[PDB]
Amino acid sequence: LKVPPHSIEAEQSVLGGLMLDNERWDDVAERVVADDFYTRPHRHIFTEMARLQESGSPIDLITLAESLERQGQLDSVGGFAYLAELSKNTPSAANISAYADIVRERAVVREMISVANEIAEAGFDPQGRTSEDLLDLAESRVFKIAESRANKDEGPKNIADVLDATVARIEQLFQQPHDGVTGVNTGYDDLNKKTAGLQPSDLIIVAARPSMGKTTFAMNLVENAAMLQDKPVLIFSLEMPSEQIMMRSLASLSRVDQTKIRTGQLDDEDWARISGTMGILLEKRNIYIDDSSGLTPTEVRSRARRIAREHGGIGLIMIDYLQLMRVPALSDNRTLEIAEISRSLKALAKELNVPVVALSQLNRSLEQRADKRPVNSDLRESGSIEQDADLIMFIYRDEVYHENSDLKGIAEIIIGKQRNGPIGTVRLTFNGQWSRFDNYAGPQY
Template identity: 30%
Template sequence: MEAEQSVLGGLMLDNNAWDTVAEVVLEQHFYSGNHRSIYRTMQKLVDDGRPIDVVTLSEELDRTAELEQAGGLEYLVSLARNTPSVSNIRAYSEIVRDRALLRQMIEVANEIADNAFFPEGRASEEILNEAEQKIFKIAENRPNQGGPEPINPLLKKAVDRIDHLFNNSDAMTGTTTGFDDLDARTGGLQPSDLIIVAARPSMGKCIVAGSTLVDPRTGAVRTIDEMVAQEDGAVVSLTNDFKLVRQSASEFVDDGIKPVFEVVTALGRRIQTTLTHPFLTGNGWQKLESIRVGERIAVPRVLPIFGDRRIETHRLKALAYFLSDGGMTQSSPLFTNTNDRILADFTEAMLAFGGISVNRVNFDERAPSYRVSAKASDSGALRRRFAVALNHAMESCGLTGKQLAERLKLRTSTISQWRNAVAMPAPSGYTSLCSALGAGFEQATSRDFESGSARVNCVTAYLREQGVWGRSAPEKRIPGLVFTLEQGQIAQFLNRLFACDGGISISKSGQVRVGYGTASQVLAEQVQHLLLRFGIVAKLRSKHHHPRTQYEVEVLDRDSIERFIDRIGMIGKESAIEKARAILAAKRHHVNADTLPDTTIDYILQLKGDRSWPEIFAAKGLKCPEGYNSRLTGLSRRHLTRRRLARFAELLDDPYLEALAHSDLYWDPVVSIEYKGERQVYDLTVPELHNFIAQDICVHNTTFSMNLVENALMGTNKPVLVFSLEMPADQLVSRMLSSLGRIDQTKVRSGQLEEDDWPRLTAAVNMLKNKPLYIDDQPGISPNEMRARARRIVREHGELGLIMVDYLQLMSMKNGKSEGRTQEISEISRSLKALAKEMECPVVALSQLNRSLEQRPNKRPVNSDLRESGAIEQDADVIMFIYRDEVYNEDSPDKGVAEIIIGKQRNGPIGTTRLAFIGKYTRFENLAHSYDYGPDE
């Protein structure tokens, strides 16, 4: 208390001491409430340029009604009178500050203890993180201990630095980037600098507009165009152990117009992508440009996604029957079929609509056709019910027939006919009538109107509502509603489709086949997709011997046929299904299509090594089957089934083989890759897994930044800290091993290394071993958490050499306030700059670019292309952009070359540095260096 009194009294005696005190003490540092009030008022007087003394201070406190709370005039006089010495005011201020810090620590310590004693269900790790943040917050609230420095000591520092550089001409002024030209331009990555590295996500890895993806939340099928436009979407993604999971896209990328190629597989699945878009092969993720016809790519063997919606059974059957054997281009719906069981089921469904009659329209030798129309015999009753509802609604609204006619601009006699059940309005008149009389009238009459209208029956209205009415056979497609239905209803829908336009057949050799035929390619693809949801792998092929192309969906493998029989079936064809079931049950299980890529065999033989199979069997306590060695000799020339692979996985105790054997994947050979011209393309960024399922095919979506980390790590003994908000730590390390060891990253990811790769891997491991590299892969980390963890590394391991953040837009403030994403990015950007200054090391943060640059002829980025660019551009000391011309121009003369464009450098020149880019190693190199990478690189 005495120190607080001395500070306040000293300020009243010497106003010039304010600057000294303000550097040390904040208002909240005063323990006494009246002292805080006095200090706050003093600060206001200083800000207003007024003197601080007993008179001015008491007057201002009196004006704000705080004088009595502050102790009154007498107390202010005693403060000034009892101050020991103004010359010691800084020492008094430090006492006030130190006691305040101790009180804060006591308060926080009590809160930490309370949280530990009463965790209220929270995890200990969460409580620990909160405790650490509270402690660091105390330090953050301290006044800045720095201040303006006089010129002389600064001159000495500058001259000493110049002298040091002169005598050490090879010394870097900052942390090396590892790239000679870039170091020459920047002097390395400078301490306390915030360096922004920006590029467009995906860099050309895109799929064509109109490509479809399944929303795992609802079962709905959406186009990638819709997802990008709405910037919303969950996707199905593939894990590292080859299982399908639900993921949320974090970025939605409009990549403009680019050349695309169509990939068609043996199953008939097709997708259009750019050449740089990767597919999963036996050699890992490979760009399309590296894939050849005949190579197998991964597609899902099952997409177990269903919605939770239900519709009335008769409406579901109506869609299935009219999409298969229905005609929807005449005045009334027609249905043609010869199966009595199907006809009975169809008729029952139609009559359930109400006010409907089903009548045969041809009696010749052709297959019978049935017209679905409004029931004529009921039309009088429908008109009478409509008239009663109309008169009641008019009475409720207080309208006469003349008034209603004037409102609708009709003759009074027309209204009279409706009111007396002589006629019903046309659709346009009914719409106007509902607008005039309200929703209650429409609800009471809609069903009768649909049934009684001479121009539209309720079945036609329903088909039109679902978007299928008026479509010819080649134009038919399944409405979006069906994809969101629950599993049982989708099975029932497929049951009716296959019952009409499909069938189950048994050849003379006993081969069982399930097939579905249609003139619509889209409908065939949709049926193939819906079967996939049940784990039924179907092949789609086209037949051209008909006057118009026909499309057939075939189910040929035993497991899929049995699933179809058990879970879907076909009404009216039960006897054929039971016969097929019996034949399959009597057959030995044989697979000739659902097999693994040949690279799996190479991997097995690599695991086997020099051991004999009898030795391997003996190690497991098993007897090796006779002739096993000779059978395995042919492995490299035959495909391997999943069932057999599972036995190898168990025999060799290998988790990778185990994951492959029980994966959700089917390995589908590519049958064609054709150029389709330039198309609008899009892409998605999927955090962590970086892949998603589109068109029922697995497709994939930091290189330069991690090369900076590698080079900084090798060029300094200081710790390097990486915050990887997008990619898991183990994947990041795998990339570094690929880059440092110059090993194809797909081999590293799949583990299928060749003999000469192992020494390179060992060398890369040794290069990284015991290096002070620390990786934090917590998603959505905040600047406060980042600062706390950086401080911990400094405290435990010494001064940092580099901090890498991948990437800035994935950070969050976590302060409970939301003033818009732009404001949040501004705070994050300022925090990163403050982190660089506090840690006295370069902070490299990756950032994304706006999509607008894709619309420009010259796609080289500029500063304004930065997402939320204002604050980032202002806070950054250096801004670098990565540009590869080959991504945008297929015939670019600069293939294998990357431009590092410096768009801003606070203390140096801007310009462009060219580097070599080696894609399969995810590595940048000095362009002037020559390396023997083989003829294709």
Template identity: 30%
Template sequence: MTTLFSMEMEQAVLSTLMTVDNSLNALDVKPSVEDFFATRHQEIYAAIETLNIQGREYDGIVLKEHFEAQNKLHQIGGEEYIIELMAAPSRPNSIKTYIFKLKKLTECRKIEEAGKRIVELAQNTLLDDLPIKAQEIMAGVDGVVSTGSRHEVSDSAVIALEVLNTKQQHKKNQSGLAYGVNTGLRDLDAMIGDIEPSHLCVIAGAPGGGKTTMAQMIAINAVKRNNAPTLFFSCEMAHYEVTNRLLSCLGRIPFEHIKRADMTDDDYTSWVHMTANVFPQYPLTIVDKAGITIAEIRGEIKKTVAQHGRIGCVIVDYLQLMTDHNYKDQFDVITAVSKGLKVIAKDFHVPVIALSQLKKESIGRKLTMSDLRGSGQIAQDADQIIMLYPDEANLGVVIANVVKNRHGKSGEVRLLSRFNYCQFVNVAKEGAA
């Protein structure tokens, strides 16, 4: 019998949900049914989710009526247990911490169960391929996340409706939260939509063509507008170089002033304001490491989840500089890296933005998916691919060619480059003032 659970925390979470109005919708990270160890707690939380989807209250009286209608009230301990939960201490200020701890206990139970299965394997001398079977079990442990991988279609339909409602709200009110992340550029976002959790978006372009600028705009939009904890893996630039670009964009400091160390008084004032007052509010972490591996990225994501309770966006600049020690040939390395990034997007239910180099012979012309450097696997794994190249007919205009969009439209969007402030801006619409 496992000891990896906490009845007190489970009761505190349920009590808070039942006694504080709209408490479930107010949560950034919601628990799942499996995060509750006690069967009756699982039943109660499932009922709360169902009532919430239906737009109904989920206090003690409504829950009692819900279980009575299903003839299940006795299964959760009757009306007496609902009253007991309602009387338990409500912890609205601590509920996020409790949910995070319950999720950690869920992961620990999964690992404990995997260990038991390996012990059972080791004791069975008649089975063939024991090492392979043990590796399969451990591979499952490595991918442990806070939700399971099996979903009944009826339950999945409820979640799909939640996602649909979120997207509709964002569509109606563009100042609202994106479902995932986006660029903040009107026409490009209208083309690709949100870069959703579990999506791998690849941004490719020539050196100096705006790949990192586009990536940093996504990072800024994620943390500034969505408060989404974001990891920016910089395999090429030092962390302070990435920060310099962010300061230029957000602080309106000409990038040339920063590069030449020729700052005006206004530049310094803006720099201090951003450093002291703005950046502390942004959950953005820069990981500055060349040759980083998929395993190291997974480790950093888990640290972010431990710190913030969730991960909102992962950016890799750029994937050809990543390493996989299992392979020597660069083609095989990039193939493994591409697959690994897509698995990360799925496992952690997070948008992954990966920058990509181009083949040398592709620079200076219109780009296609075949111009991605290293492996055709990138084009297969990506949900969106955005190619950036200059518009030869219009100085200062960059074409963002969406050559692949698995879940929407493809086509070209024109953007104005403002590289002196490390950003892109929208092309003004005809007739706009």
């Protein structure tokens, strides 16, 4: 019931794994230490192995016994006969660092109990000592423990440990001298300038009123990517089903109208363009659609990670009308619901290192404003999706509100926020007959 908590079987398993593989010792040398172990024979074995890996790389069965022999230690450290059992056991695979980490943790635990014993000792043993000379000692010891637990990554880093990563990214980008696109491209040249391409660890938002084009624009982004991104994409159509999506997308990629598709009065050239774009999409095999209705961020994360390990690793994610996302815990408070959603999506993007398009709606506030250009406040709910987002870009198409516009066939992509870049107003030509946005070779902005 009561004992020093220690695991000693996985310990020997690590020992034999190091024996049968003289390559991966540095990675466990990061974690495991000679005094980390519990019993002294294992400690002798590991520290001898370490002294040898300084000098003698080959250490499996006999170099160990020889180095142990030259200084006269056989049968005082167990035995070569006993060592046979260690090399015999654990022919296991690269599942070694797990054992290493967990036993390293057990060592930390054992040390904690040791120091609690020391504190109890110094407590019941006064030695003519005061609370002020005692609690301060206790604080200093526990401080030395928690401060130094062989942990480097999670803690606040000195600047030289940050500039290494910064210069590393700069070398990753200079070592490939290429265009002014530091991530995913869209297919649109007027927008890649104000974005440097959809960057790879952000939460993009694509918001606009309902009849405006945001699902259309998003599908255009993803299909263009998947035509120039040899790497998967995802599409979560929580609103409409896959069979509307793909129809819209064939119309987009082939510049034929949607009625002609669904109803079936299309001409030989139309049939040909369809044939070609199909036979393209079926080769690259990027697009993966999920027409699930009421998802949660957990389901999103799982269904994205499933791809991201087996189909390689992914290039972007699209999410239609995230206000349908749910989390039943926060089912009463809608505001905190959306905040949890958005935080989880940003976390996902930082996890998988991809962008996360996340379509959203706007509120019926701009209608009584007479300009109609959507400002960042005009987001459907919670105000936090303008806070966790590293990019927002609204859509406004003046022909909807003004029949007397000189701005018809024209949609402008109001960048309404961008942390790592400028704001602006891109413009593009709308042709919803085949559900596409296209570039605008015309006046500047």
